[PDB]
């Protein structure tokens, strides 16, 4: 049998994970500043709570996914806005007001200057998950790492986990639903359409 | 086409009972120790893992199989020399409260008392920090694929390297031919064979 390994993030994983994060959104679209996608979606976890990050490796020891289990959502989104967004703004300048001109990088850079955080559901769902998988990862492996990260959060006293899932990820949404997640509402994560989904414990 | 997904993750206090069970089943060649350590079977876990759980639980990683069964553990001790200073100065008082000193009749000793004696007559492993800063522990049930064992060892070594380790040692039971072959196949060398808390060990090591 193919052995997948789920293991803690190590700092040396960063470049590989930024590349996966770019591919999952891909590396053909963002040719000027490929790092901007990871900066938006992954860097905050690496900076604030790297111990939240689990990495998924396939049978050939290749990184094919990650999952962040964020114990304290409220604190995460607060510090995202106050600590991380300040940093990525300083790295990714506001583009000119001509929306026509804009490269894909410039759409995302502009989105950093127009941030609204998702609804605080932290009193009902303490925690949240962030996940990205290669199209190759078996669904049963995705279910395993989800079941793992939910046990980890519950073991740390979480009473519930939300997730902002890209609305277009039909297959992934079906996996979360089948595990007991329900759709709460839609939310725009900067330039990105999401469904806010959630589960108790 | 068939897939299993293993988790390596930090120890949580709730793991202790299952880990102690794995230690007990693993401690004697071709025997679960559950039928020999009839009086105080927790003395095995206390010997094998107690010092880590007490002093440095962050050193302990637990392996889960595809259906959440704990099927192994490893310890990555970044600084062996400090770890065994703490083992002597802090842990030995605690483990001697859990396990009494045997009476002076060696002939009549239970398996528990043979182990308990080691706690009252402790000597730290050879100090090999001139070559190897860190040390390991590793125990896997029968179910764990060797390819997973190797990947999980490498993870602990990569973690130690990242934290500044230039090398790792390990005491392995000399009778554990299979696990010794795995470590040797990964580039570990045998430095020494010597009794360490009443058990015949090989001290093995790799540079990082």
Q: What is the CA radius of gyration of chain A?
A: 16
Q: How far is CA B105 from the centre of its chain?
A: 29
Q: Which of B176, B181, B178, B179 is nearest to B200 (CA)?
A: B176
Q: Which of A42, A13, A176, A146 is nearest to B5 (CA)?
A: A146
Rounded CA gap, A84 and B75, in Å? Answer: 34
What is the C-alpha to C-alpha distance for residues A44 and A62, in angstroms, rounded to an integer?
A: 23
Q: Give the separation between CA A22 and CA A36, rounded to whole angstroms.
A: 8
From residue B66, alpha-carbon distances to A3, A195, B16, B144 in Å are 9, 29, 20, 11
Say whether residue B4 is in contact with chain A using an 8 A CB cutoff: yes
DSSP H or E segment with residue B165? none
CB < 8 Å to B162, chain A: 10-12
Q: Which has the closest alpha carbon to B41: B110, B140, B143, B117?
A: B110
Q: Helix (H, G, I), strand (E, B), or coil: what is residue A71?
A: coil
Burial A129-160 (b: 16+ CB within 10 A, else e): bbbbbeeebbeebbebbbebbbbbbbeeebeb
CB A130 within 8 A of CB A45: yes
Closest CA to B47 of B96, B101, B12: B96
B14 at A interface, C-beta within 8 A: yes
Tell me which chain A residues have a C-beta less than 8 angstroms from the C-beta of B68. Answer: 147-148, 151
CB-based contacts of B138: which residues, under 8 Å, 6+ apart? B72, B73, B74, B75, B149, B153, B170, B172, B179
Token output for A172: 């992934």
Among the partner-chain residues B10, B66, B145, the one whose CB lies closest to the CB of A144 is B66
- Nearest-angstrom CA–CA distance, A200 and A156: 14
CA distance to partner chain A, nearest, from residue B58 (Å): 12
Six-digit token string for A168: 């277009």
Nearest to residue A92, comparing CAs of A112, A68, A69? A112
Q: Which of B197, B66, B88 is nearest to B143 (CA)?
A: B66
**Closest residue, chain B, to A147 (C-alpha):** B68
Asked if the Cβ–Cβ distance from A3 to B151 is below 8 Å, we say: yes
For residue B46 the two structure tokens come to: 């206390």
Q: How far is CA A108 from the centre of its chain?
A: 15
Asked if residue B201 lies in contact with residue B170, where contact means CB atoms within 8 angstroms, the answer is: no
Least Cα separation, residue A79 to chain B (angstroms): 25
Contact A2, A58 (CB under 8 A): yes
Rounded CA-CA distance A74/A82 in Å is 12
- Note whether A60 contacts B: Cβ–Cβ < 8 A: no
* Separation of alpha carbons B207 and B166, rounded Å: 6
Residues A79, A56: Cα–Cα separation, whole Å: 26
* DSSP-derived secondary structure for A125-179: --EEEEEEE-TTS-HHHHHHHHHHHHHHHHHTT--EEEEEEETT-HHHHHHHHHT
Q: Which domain holds residue A181?
A: 1-201
The token pair that represents B77 in the structure block: 């001790």
Put simply, whether B164 touches A (Cβ < 8 Å) is no
Q: Does B158 touch chain A (CB under 8 A)?
A: yes
Bridge partners (DSSP) of residue A4 are B5
Does B8 contact chain A (CB < 8 Å)?
A: yes
Query: Which one, of A29, A46, A132, lies nearest residue A87 by Cα?
Result: A46
Query: What's the rounded Cα separation, in Å, for the pair B58 and B163?
Result: 13
Put simply, whether B2 touches A (Cβ < 8 Å) is yes
H or E stretch at B17: helix B16-26
Nearest Cα of chain B lies from the Cα of A74 at a distance, in angstroms, of 25
Determine the Cα–Cα distance for residues A143 and A162; give it in Å rounded to an integer: 16
Please give the resolution of this entry in Å, rounded to 1 decimal: 1.8
CA dist A149 and B84 (Å) reads 34
Write down the H helix ranges in chain A. Answer: 14-24, 35-41, 43-48, 73-79, 85-91, 104-111, 139-155, 170-178
Q: Check if B10 contacts A (Cβ < 8 Å).
A: yes
B159 touches chain A (CB under 8 A): yes
Distance from CA of A151 to the nearest CA of B (A): 10
Mutate to test the interface with A, among B1, B2, B5, B8 (most CBs of A within 10 A): B5
Terminal CA-to-CA distance of chain A, rounded, Å? 31
Closest Cα to residue B55, out of B90, B80, B19, B20? B90
- Alpha-helical (H) ranges within B37-189 are 42-45, 51-55, 80-86, 92-98, 111-119, 146-162, 177-185
Place of tokens 């990683």: B61
| Number of structural domains in chain A | 1
A96 in reach of chain B (CB within 8 A): no
Alpha-carbon distance values, B149 to A27, B4, B141 (Å): 34, 14, 10
Q: Which two tokens stand for residue A41?
A: 């979606």
The two three-digit tokens of residue A16, written as one number: 């590989």
The count of other CB atoms within 10 Å of the CB of residue A81 is 13
How far is B49 from A116, CA to CA, in rounded Å? Answer: 48
Cα B68 from Cα B77, distance rounded (Å): 25
B-chain residues near A57 (CB < 8 A):
151
């Amino acid at each position: 049998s193919d052995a997948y390994v789920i293991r803690p993030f190590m700092p040396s994983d960063e470049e590989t994970l930024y590349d996966l994060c770019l591919k999952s959104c891909g590396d053909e679209i963002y040719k000027r500043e490929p790092r901007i996608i990871g900066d938006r979606d992954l860097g905050a976890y690496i900076y604030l709570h790297p111990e939240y990050i689990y990495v998924l490796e396939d049978d050939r020891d290749k990184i094919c996914g990650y999952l962040c289990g964020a114990l304290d959502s409220k604190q995460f989104y607060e510090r995202y806005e106050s600590e991380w967004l300040t940093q990525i703004r300083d790295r990714h300048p506001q583009p000119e007001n001509d929306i026509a001109s804009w490269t894909p990088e410039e759409i995302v850079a502009n989105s950093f200057y127009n941030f609204t955080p998702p609804t605080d559901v932290s009193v009902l769902y303490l925690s949240h998950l962030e996940a990205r998988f290669d199209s190759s990862v078996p669904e049963k492996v995705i279910k395993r790492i989800i079941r793992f990260i939910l046990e980890q959060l519950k073991a740390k006293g979480s009473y519930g986990a939300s997730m902002l899932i890209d609305s277009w990820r039909t297959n992934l949404r079906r996996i979360f639903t089948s595990m007991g997640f329900v759709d709460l509402q839609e939310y725009s994560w900067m330039s990105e359409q999401k469904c806010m989904i959630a589960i108790k414990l």
